[PDB]
Amino acid sequence: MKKYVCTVCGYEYDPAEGDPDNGVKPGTSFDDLPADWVCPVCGAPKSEFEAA
Ligand SMILES: [Zn+2]
């Protein structure tokens, strides 16, 4: 149950509701997220996502 925020745009990701805008299920945590995931804002790796 950890949230993160992009360090490029400044958008926060809510794994609680998932990202259906991309096709991600509402039951997928950040650790569950895919390895080919990218910010829904720009499209950067988790390497750009830190802990809120
Ligand atoms: Zn971003």
Curated annotation (Swiss-Prot):
Signal peptide: none annotated. One of its GO terms (biological process) is alkane catabolic process. It comes from the Bacteria. It is found in: Cytoplasm. Binds 1 Fe(3+) ion per subunit. CDD domains: rubredoxin. NCBIfam families: RubredRD. GO terms for cellular component: cytoplasm. Fe cation binds at C6, C9, C39, C42. The gene is rub. The lineage of its organism: Bacteria, Pseudomonadati, Thermodesulfobacteriota, Desulfovibrionia, Desulfovibrionales. Its cofactor is Fe(3+). The keyword Electron transport applies. This is Rubredoxin. Belongs to the rubredoxin family. Rubredoxin is a small nonheme, iron protein lacking acid-labile sulfide. Its single Fe, chelated to 4 Cys, functions as an electron acceptor and may also stabilize the conformation of the molecule. Residues 1-52 form the Rubredoxin-like domain. The keyword Methyltransferase does not apply. SUPFAM superfamilies: Rubredoxin-like (SSF57802). Keywords: Cytoplasm, Electron transport, Iron, Metal-binding, Transport. PROSITE patterns: RUBREDOXIN (PS00202), RUBREDOXIN_LIKE (PS50903). Its main location: cytoplasm. One of its GO terms (molecular function) is iron ion binding.
